[PDB]
Design a protein around this ligand. Structure first.
Ligand SMILES: CCCCCCCCCCCCCCCCCC(=O)OC[C@H](COP(=O)([O-])OCC(O)COP(=O)([O-])OC[C@@H](COC(=O)CCCCCCCCCCCCCCCCC)OC(=O)CCCCCCCCCCCCCCCCC)OC(=O)CCCCCCCCCCCCCCCCC
Ligand SMILES: CCCCCCCCCCCCCCCCCC(=O)OC[C@H](COP(=O)([O-])OCC(O)COP(=O)([O-])OC[C@@H](COC(=O)CCCCCCCCCCCCCCCCC)OC(=O)CCCCCCCCCCCCCCCCC)OC(=O)CCCCCCCCCCCCCCCCC
Ligand SMILES: CCCCCCCCCCCCCCCCCC(=O)OC[C@H](COP(=O)([O-])OCC(O)COP(=O)([O-])OC[C@@H](COC(=O)CCCCCCCCCCCCCCCCC)OC(=O)CCCCCCCCCCCCCCCCC)OC(=O)CCCCCCCCCCCCCCCCC
Ligand SMILES: CCCCCCCCCCCCCCCCCC(=O)OC[C@H](COP(=O)([O-])OCC[N+](C)(C)C)OC(=O)CCCCCCCCCCCCCCCCC
Ligand SMILES: CCCCCCCCCCCCCCCCCC(=O)OC[C@H](COP(=O)([O-])OCC[N+](C)(C)C)OC(=O)CCCCCCCCCCCCCCCCC
Ligand SMILES: CCCCCCCCCCCCCCCCCC(=O)OC[C@H](COP(=O)([O-])OCC[N+](C)(C)C)OC(=O)CCCCCCCCCCCCCCCCC
Ligand SMILES: CCCCCCCCCCCCCCCCCC(=O)OC[C@H](COP(=O)(O)OCCN)OC(=O)CCCCCCCCCCCCCCCCC
Ligand SMILES: CCCCCCCCCCCCCCCCCC(=O)OC[C@H](COP(=O)(O)OCCN)OC(=O)CCCCCCCCCCCCCCCCC
Ligand SMILES: CCCCCCCCCCCCCCCCCC(=O)OC[C@H](COP(=O)(O)OCCN)OC(=O)CCCCCCCCCCCCCCCCC
Lengths: 178, 51, 109, 93, 360, 231, 120, 149, 116
């Protein structure tokens, strides 16, 4: 926001911060569905304590979906959860908040170890039996599996397509004051 | 001590429920309907809690 | 929010309504008169009767939005033209089909 | 959420102030800077702060010994006579 | 109004009432699904089955259909940026986009919920009817033009959420045959109901006090009027009692902290999460982050931006206390649902820091 | 809602605008016709002297004692467990005395009030006499707070918990420099605002601003690199 | 709703009770009460009661009580429109009829689930 | 871009043709088509009902049958009577939604938001300065969804 | 002696303090919740009378409705304590010691800890 001979020059977008907040909320919701879609695909009664991340030790799809969702929650790049934290820190730097950046970093590192701590519990002495039995065989829901496939695609390669989501969210937020 | 006799004789109101009517049925009617739906849903939830 | 002219115009008194048909009839007449004059600045006193009709029919927020939009339109019309904008957008899209290589070893600044 | 009604179903005493404030806010390009007079009139109608400050000053001045006797009033002539004037219906006769 | 009642005051209300009537008609006719009289001249081809456990897949499909119809209404929606029904609701592009986004995410979660419910049926019709009621009214919050109507909308939504928590299944069919003649005491249901009820009570009373004192400060609770009056007061310096403004901000923020379960008030959220089904956690997180926390942020960003001169310090203090209070606690838990709840809390604190950076 | 308003003030800008200045003399000057009571009561202006170091130290100690009393009331007294026999004796004292609750609160809050007063006074003296002439304000604040809080936690909480006290002092110093020492969320002037002198002509100022705008156009990456298509 | 005159009448009612108390004492002059073992004990049709303080009810009608609370609230909400029904319009009429419909719907749902009876 | 002629049975398809992705117009922004009745009442909208709204209702009836069947595909432990009743209720709900859509279309035609067979005397002159969609739509299906390109 | 605004705000927050102050018996907390709602009711009436706002007088019945709904839910929750083997005095539902209770003493359901 500069002025030259009573003419105002505006190089800053006021609605960018709300778009970043919306992107963070949406990314968290997408990753939260991804972790809980794997849970809803299994015997929900098998997950009671934190040590029972070993139950996810099963055929490679459930195991890798769980570990990648946990890594995404912790903010490990280039997963979808990393993008929101990176954009939040970028906007805080743009808003010139070094103390807020410091406290965000403290919270991020503590929460990241909080998430990746459970990756140690996933090691199990044998493959687990966490699927419900229907018609004498394990019930694997193809629809939930497909949902997890889509969420995994947008969690692994979502950083390549994040620009369009950013455009959509900035467009939505641009209506707040106009 | 000031009394507006023109407004007095132009006033046909005979009860103190006029602000309540003007609220729950003119302007705050949205919240009136919201409270009705709230009480209906609360009765449903009370039945479900009893069950 | 307190600085938003649009959000302040969206506010209204209880029971206040806008006769949009009458408002836009008056606005069309007044703006037709103004465009017939076609001045750099909108001198509303040069279209007296239509100015009074526009003031009476339209609300303050509606007139404020109309004047802001007229200023924006006048600026855009003084700056650009249809064919120029079409060619510029075509060139911009064609360039967007490529890459922006850095200008290594520049000659300025 | 401004009703515009009084407690007897009539008109709120600050409705014209609110209407003028809203008219100024919608009309002005810089309503915060330009509608100070109308906004302050509405705020004075709502919070009678100026009247309360006046009452505080009047109480402080009445705590002093400046004023002894106010002029008495008679409605038949609709006028104020000095307290020293021996009129009818006076407390001291 | 008195003489004429314009359509533009309830044109948006018409589809909401249509969906409400359809939903409740289905729900009422479902409660008598087993009442089908056999007359003395009727022959039964099969012996009637009197034990019924209907899969709620059709209820979820109905919810998806009506939410999709609401989406279709929003896509074809037209109008002016204005306030309808006595300025208690706002029809603007941002509010409508928030409505649409909430409905879209509700549709996604309901679709996944149906796909899950076809696997194993641990939930009843009433649970998904409560979810139906949440999804119908929770987008209406973003249309609020007043803290009064917002308070009543969140009261309705909180009643619906309490209803959803009530209808969680208590006992299951399991392979644990060792407990048939002994009394096992599970207290998660009562803990969930207790903590949800009391957090709702505290948030409601604090929001009511805030509304009462905002009516005193301004004479109106419309978002535009509150912001205009507070901003002009900073220009006129008329209402200089910073104690009252600070206390209004504190009451609003603390009420929302109690409602959302943000640190340092998060142990009740931990207790609630570990007493709910995973589907309940799914839906509760969806509603909390997309609606409740979003309106929290928009209160600090959009609705009450004129009060940011007092909001920033309270938000900073709460963020610092939460950061330095939960870092130790997130490492002494040993429960899956506690892990999920603390993930939610950590993300909430991160986003609170983000909105603090925004309001700068 | 502001922090350290008097110290964080652009006196030049305030004087140019005519805004009231917190640095203006806040004092009373009696004439030689006032009563002796008027002369005595006008001596209360000494309590408004921010350059009176004894008064400043006393008020810093009072603020620290208030913080300590608040901590004891809300987080301190309830956390620790008083022996049952001691509580019974205290309640017996309350029973047999007309205002025993005040005595109980005096006894309970005295260690916390004294610790807060001492910490506040020592902190004020330390900051005022040791670190008020350092060049790097942020570094001085961080180091001073780190050392002070390390010493404080080594003597108030536990000597073993001194690394954590040093880290907390570093964080508190960063926070204090960010908000108590800097005008973040407390700006008193618009960003990019300035004042004019020299009685320059408006034409000359317009020409200078045009020159500035021409230089400003070099800040755009497309303009500077010549990556603009012909519009 | 009354005023200080109502408060003074409450005081006068208390004084009337004092008059009744005086009459009862004067009547107490006219008899003697002899102390007996079971005279000042509980009456349970001629035999000693097996419980003194722990006389607990089952309270099978708590649903009826909570519905009474809700419907009393609803009737209080209905009062204002009926008080000023002469000035009704389309909006007021629609709101009143919709509110009564909601009350009826809530009652019917209560009937469908058999929560209006006694439970074991 | 052309729109389906109003008062026909395909006039409701104009609801899916929007020139801008905006939900609503600004306060002082002129609607795309002349206003017939800005202060529309419920019976004014009912009187403005026509073949476009009837066609919207017919479309709801036609598409509502497979949607009701899809909803019923998740129903179990139900007698034939309850199945038929549930289907009837869902189908009636979809037809009521079609009625609501027709009412909205009539209201929009009254307010000039959608095509109503009228044109302003002077069209609003807009310069398409920012244009990322013209070339995309001229070579795709979406030219039928955006009015005036 | 106090102005009514000061008195009503002060005693609303006093009721909120007393609700926390009292022992956590669910029925008592429910009663204090009703009292808090009534304090809000009276404060809203006071502010409506002061500022001539019918909307503040409107919250009189709204507060009554919200309080009635919450009281019905509280009655149901208090009934629910019976079926979950939960004491109404919530301080007796945990093994944590506290000196506030004279008689709190919980022991394992065993006769002997050591067999010879
Ligand atoms: C224009 C010229 C371009 C030239 C090329 C340029 C580069 C192309 C784009 C590359 C972008 C990569 C960005 C990093 C992503 C990392 C995320 C991750 O770890 O994902 C794991 C994921 C595989 O996970 P996994 O270990 O198989 O997990 C086991 C399953 O979960 C469980 O296994 P299962 O047996 O149960 O089920 C199998 C099923 C499991 O299902 C899923 O995983 C569901 C999701 C995928 C569905 C299938 C695709 C649908 C479409 O499928 C898979 O596991 C296959 C997943 C896809 C592998 C693709 C490998 C080739 C790269 C394709 C890129 C496409 C971009 C669009 O992807 C990879 O590991 C890909 C390899 C790494 C990237 C490519 C190699 C490097 C190329 C240059 C990189 C330059 C980077 C520059 C900066 C970029 C960021 C700003
Ligand atoms: C209006 C305010 C609200 C009034 C009703 C409150 C009802 C309860 C609300 C809920 C919270 C309860 C908390 C726990 C509790 O109290 O349990 C009940 C507690 C336990 O019940 P219990 O087991 O039956 O006890 C048996 C005996 O009754 C035991 O009795 P005791 O003799 O042991 O206790 C005497 C009692 C009552 O003491 C007094 O009333 C003291 C009166 C003189 C105060 C000092 C002079 C004030 C000068 C005013 C004018 C200043 C002008 C400006 C000057 C310049 C200022 C810069 O004082 C206290 O309990 C200690 C409170 C602090 C005393 C004053 C400290 C002043 C510090 C500097 C300011 O019972 C009582 O204490 C009895 C009274 C009820 C509680 C009153 C609490 C008042 C606390 C605020 C201070 C009031 C005086 C100063 C006003 C100005 C302050 C700025
Ligand atoms: C100790 C272990 C270190 C290694 C840990 C492990 C490695 C990884 C961690 C990171 C390690 C590096 C940490 C760097 C912190 C930030 C420094 C910085 O950016 O300074 C800007 C500054 C450039 O700005 P400038 O405008 O030139 O400032 C010059 C004057 O300060 C401007 O004029 P003035 O008026 O400010 O001048 C006076 C100033 C002149 O400065 C000095 O004389 C040195 C100041 C540092 C003294 C540290 C003493 C520690 C032992 C005691 O002196 C003082 O203020 C008092 C000096 C005595 C302090 C006694 C109290 C110490 C409390 C306990 C330690 C607290 C540490 C806080 C760290 C905060 C990090 C955010 O650069 C430096 O000061 C050079 C960096 C090295 C400083 C001395 C380091 C000594 C220990 C070396 C260990 C090597 C391994
Ligand atoms: C104080 C009130 C009691 C004061 C008693 C002593 C002073 C007194 O009565 O003075 C009477 C005298 C007046 O006496 P007065 O004789 O004028 O009394 C009135 C006589 N008639 C009815 C005939 C008009 O002074 C005052 O009343 C002055 C003010 C007194 C305080 C107020
Ligand atoms: C680590 C270092 C921590 C501080 C060390 C001690 C500093 C003070 C030394 C004693 C002299 C003193 O206090 O002088 C300042 C002042 C001198 O009194 P004064 O108020 O007359 O100061 C006038 C201004 N100077 C300092 C320039 C003379 O005293 C105090 O601040 C009193 C401190 C104790 C209060 C109880
Ligand atoms: C009108 C109220 C009149 C009350 C008259 C006194 C009541 C009275 O004597 O009560 C009897 C009681 C007890 O009187 P008493 O014990 O003499 O009654 C026994 C009476 N004879 C001998 C006939 C069996 O009197 C009192 O309590 C004291 C009375 C005032 C002295
Ligand atoms: C989430 C949000 C929750 C809160 C929402 C609050 C707002 C709710 C919506 C209010 C909508 C009000 C619509 C009023 C009905 C209406 O307009 O009916 C049409 C007609 C009157 O038409 P009109 O054109 O005004 O009359 C000719 C005079 N010019 O009316 C008539 O001919 C009849 C009169 C009106 C209806 C009377 C009652 C009928 C039954 C009601 C439902 C009962 C069940
Ligand atoms: C999120 C929160 C955001 C906060 C933002 C601001 C943070 C920094 C605030 C710093 C305030 C401060 O200490 O100011 C210094 C003040 C004196 O101010 P001034 O006179 O202007 O200073 C002159 C310059 N030397 O001096 C004081 O205020 C003196 C008191 C400061 C030190 C207090 C220490 C603690 C006191 C209570 C201890 C209780 C101990 C209990 C446990 C033991 C019990 C036995
Ligand atoms: C040459 C070609 C020949 C032919 C080829 C073959 C045929 C091609 C057919 C092409 C497609 C035809 C489409 C027909 C109509 C489809 C309508 C539709 O999908 O609309 C989507 C809707 C429209 O957006 P819009 O109109 O801007 O919104 C209302 C504004 N008044 O948009 C929205 O609702 C937008 C919602 C925005 C907010 C939510 C989304 C952003 C935030 C979340 C991001 C994603 C995260 C996950 C969300 C859940 C996903 C399930």
């Amino acid at each position: 926001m500069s002025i030259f001979s009573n003419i105002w020059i505006n190089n800053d977008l006021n609605s960018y911060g709300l778009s970043i907040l919306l992107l963070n909320i949406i990314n968290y919701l997408i990753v939260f569905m991804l972790i809980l879609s794997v849970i809803l695909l299994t015997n929900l009664s098998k997950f009671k304590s934190l040590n029972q991340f070993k139950e996810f030790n099963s055929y490679n799809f459930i195991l890798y979906s769980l570990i990648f969702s946990l890594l995404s929650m912790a903010g490990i790049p280039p997963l979808l959860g990393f993008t929101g934290k990176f954009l939040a820190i970028l906007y805080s730097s743009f808003k010139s908040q070094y103390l807020l950046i410091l406290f965000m970093t403290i919270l991020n590192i503590f929460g990241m170890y909080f998430y990746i701590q459970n990756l140690r519990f996933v090691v199990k002495k044998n493959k687990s039996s966490i699927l419900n039995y229907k018609n004498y065989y394990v019930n694997i829901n193809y629809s939930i599996t497909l949902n997890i496939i889509l969420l995994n695609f947008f969690n692994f390669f979502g950083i390549l397509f994040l620009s369009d989501l950013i455009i959509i969210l900035n467009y939505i937020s641009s209506y707040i004051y106009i | 001590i000031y009394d507006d006799y023109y407004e007095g004789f132009n006033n046909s109101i005979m009860n103190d429920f006029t602000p309540l009517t003007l609220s729950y049925y003119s302007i705050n009617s949205a919240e009136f309907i919201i409270i009705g739906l709230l009480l209906l849903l609360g009765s449903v939830a009370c039945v479900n809690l009893y069950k | 929010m307190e600085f938003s002219n649009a959000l302040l115009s969206q506010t209204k008194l209880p029971g206040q309504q806008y006769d949009y048909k009458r408002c836009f009839q008056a606005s069309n007449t007044h703006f037709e008169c103004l465009d017939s004059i076609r001045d750099a600045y909108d001198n509303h006193h040069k279209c007296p009767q239509t100015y009074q009709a526009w003031q009476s029919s339209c609300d303050v927020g509606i007139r404020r939005y109309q004047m802001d939009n007229r200023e924006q339109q006048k600026k855009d019309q003084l700056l650009y033209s249809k064919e120029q904008l079409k060619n510029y957008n075509a060139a911009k899209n064609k360039e967007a089909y490529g890459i922006t290589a850095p200008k290594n070893l520049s000659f300025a600044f | 959420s401004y009703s515009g009604y009084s407690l007897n179903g009539g008109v709120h005493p600050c409705l014209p102030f609110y209407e003028r404030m809203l008219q100024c806010a919608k009309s002005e390009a810089l309503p915060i800077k330009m509608c100070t007079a109308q906004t302050e009139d509405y705020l004075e109608c709502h919070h009678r702060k100026k009247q309360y400050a006046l009452n505080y000053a009047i109480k402080k001045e009445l705590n002093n010994i400046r004023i002894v006797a106010l002029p008495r009033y008679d409605e038949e002539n609709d006028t104020f006579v000095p307290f020293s004037q021996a009129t009818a219906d006076h407390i001291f006769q | 109004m008195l003489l004429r009642l314009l359509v533009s005051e309830y044109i948006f209300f018409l589809p909401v009432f249509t969906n409400l009537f359809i939903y409740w008609h289905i729900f009422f006719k479902n409660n008598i699904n087993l009442v089908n009289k056999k007359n003395n001249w009727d022959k039964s081809i099969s012996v009637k089955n009197i034990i019924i456990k209907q899969n709620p897949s059709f209820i979820i499909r109905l919810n998806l259909l009506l939410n999709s119809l609401m989406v279709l209404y929003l896509i074809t929606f037209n109008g002016y940026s204005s306030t309808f029904w006595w300025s208690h609701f706002k029809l603007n592009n941002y509010s409508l986009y928030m409505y649409l986004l909430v409905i879209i995410f509700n549709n996604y979660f309901l679709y996944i919920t149906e796909k899950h419910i076809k696997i194993l049926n641990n939930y009843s019709i009433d649970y998904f009817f409560s979810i139906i009621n949440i999804t119908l009214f929770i987008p209406m919050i973003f249309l609020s033009n007043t803290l009064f109507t917002f308070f009543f909308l969140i009261e309705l939504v909180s009643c619906a959420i309490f209803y959803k928590f009530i209808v969680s299944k208590i006992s299951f069919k399991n392979s644990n045959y060792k407990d048939n003649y002994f009394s096992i005491f599970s207290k998660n249901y009562l803990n969930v109901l207790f903590y949800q009820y009391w957090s709702s009570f505290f948030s409601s009373v604090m929001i009511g006090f805030c509304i009462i004192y905002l009516f005193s400060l301004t004479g109106s609770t419309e978002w535009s009027i509150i912001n205009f009056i507070v901003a002009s007061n900073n220009q006129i310096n008329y209402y200089t009692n910073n104690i009252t403004l600070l206390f209004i901000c504190l009451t609003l923020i603390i009420g929302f902290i109690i409602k959302l379960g943000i640190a340092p008030i998060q142990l009740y959220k931990i207790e609630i999460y570990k007493g709910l089904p995973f589907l309940s956690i799914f839906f509760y997180t969806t509603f909390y982050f997309l609606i409740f926390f979003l309106f929290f942020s928009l209160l600090f960003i959009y609705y009450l931006s004129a009060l940011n001169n007092f909001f920033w310090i309270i938000l900073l203090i709460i963020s610092i206390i939460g950061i330095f209070y939960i870092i130790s606690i997130i490492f002494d838990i040993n429960l899956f649902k506690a892990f999920l709840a603390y993930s939610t809390i950590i993300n909430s604190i991160s986003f609170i820091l983000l909105i603090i950076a925004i309001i700068f | 809602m502001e922090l350290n308003s008097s110290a964080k003030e652009d006196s030049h800008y305030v004087g140019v605008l005519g805004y009231p200045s917190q640095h203006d003399p806040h004092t009373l000057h009696p004439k030689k016709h006032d009563s002796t009571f008027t002369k005595v009561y006008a001596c209360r202006d000494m309590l408004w002297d921010h350059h009176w170091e004894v008064r400043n130290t006393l008020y810093a100690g009072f603020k620290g004692a208030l913080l300590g009393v608040a901590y004891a009331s809300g987080f301190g007294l309830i956390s620790k467990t008083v022996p049952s026999i001691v509580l019974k004796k205290m309640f017996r004292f309350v029973r047999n005395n007309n205002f025993g609750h005040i005595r109980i609160m005096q006894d309970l809050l005295t260690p916390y009030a004294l610790t807060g007063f001492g910490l506040g006074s020592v902190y004020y003296l330390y900051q005022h006499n040791v670190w008020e002439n350092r060049s790097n304000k942020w570094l001085a604040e961080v180091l001073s707070n780190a050392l002070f809080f390390q010493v404080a936690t080594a003597v108030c909480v536990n000597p073993g918990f001194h690394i954590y006290g040093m880290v907390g002092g570093i964080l508190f110093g960063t926070l204090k420099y960010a908000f108590y020492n800097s005008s973040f969320f407390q700006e008193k002037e618009s960003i990019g605002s300035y004042t004019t002198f020299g009685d320059l002509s408006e034409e000359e100022r317009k020409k200078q601003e045009y020159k500035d705008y021409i230089q400003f156009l070099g800040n755009y990456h497309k303009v500077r690199n010549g990556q603009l298509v012909d519009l | 709703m009354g005023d200080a005159v109502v408060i003074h009448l409450i005081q006068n009612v208390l004084i009337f009770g004092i008059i009744f108390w005086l009459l009862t004492w004067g009547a107490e002059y006219f008899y003697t009460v002899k102390q007996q073992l079971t005279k000042k004990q509980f009456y349970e049709c001629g035999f000693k009661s097996i419980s003194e303080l722990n006389i607990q009810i089952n309270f099978n009608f708590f649903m009826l009580a909570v519905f009474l609370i809700l419907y009393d609230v609803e009737f209080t909400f209905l009062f204002p429109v009926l008080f000023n029904f002469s000035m009704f319009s389309t909006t007021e009429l629609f709101l009143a009829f919709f509110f009564i419909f909601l009350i009826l719907v809530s009652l019917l749902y209560d009937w469908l689930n058999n929560v209006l009876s006694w439970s074991a | 871009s052309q729109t389906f002629a109003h008062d026909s049975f395909l006039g409701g398809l104009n609801l899916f043709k929007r020139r801008d992705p905006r939900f609503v117009l600004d306060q002082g922004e002129r609607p795309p088509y002349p206003i017939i009745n800005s202060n529309s009442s419920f019976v004014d909208v009912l009187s403005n009902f026509n073949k476009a709204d009837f066609g919207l209702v017919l479309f709801s009836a036609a598409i509502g049958f497979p949607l009701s069947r899809w909803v019923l595909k998740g129903l179990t432990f139900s007698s034939l009577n309850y199945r038929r009743g549930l289907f009837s209720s869902v189908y009636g709900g979809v037809i009521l939604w079609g009625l609501v859509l027709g009412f909205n279309n009539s209201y929009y035609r009254l307010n000039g938001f959608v095509d109503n067979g009228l044109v302003w005397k002077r069209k609003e002159r807009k310069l398409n300065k920012y244009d990322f969609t013209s070339e995309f739509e001229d070579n795709s299906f979406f030219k039928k969804l955006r009015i005036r390109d | 002696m106090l102005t009514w605004i000061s008195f009503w705000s002060l005693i609303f927050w006093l009721i909120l303090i007393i609700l926390v102050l009292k022992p956590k018996n669910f029925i008592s907390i429910l009663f204090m919740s009703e009292l808090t709602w009534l304090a809000l009711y009276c404060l809203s009436l006071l502010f409506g009378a002061i500022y001539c706002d019918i909307t503040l007088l409107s919250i009189s019945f709204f507060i009554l409705g919200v309080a009635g709904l919450e009281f019905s839910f509280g009655i149901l929750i208090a009934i629910l304590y019976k079926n979950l083997n939960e004491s109404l005095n919530t301080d007796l539902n945990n093994n944590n010691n506290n000196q506030n209770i004279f008689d709190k003493n919980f022991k394992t359901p065993l006769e002997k800890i050591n067999w010879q």
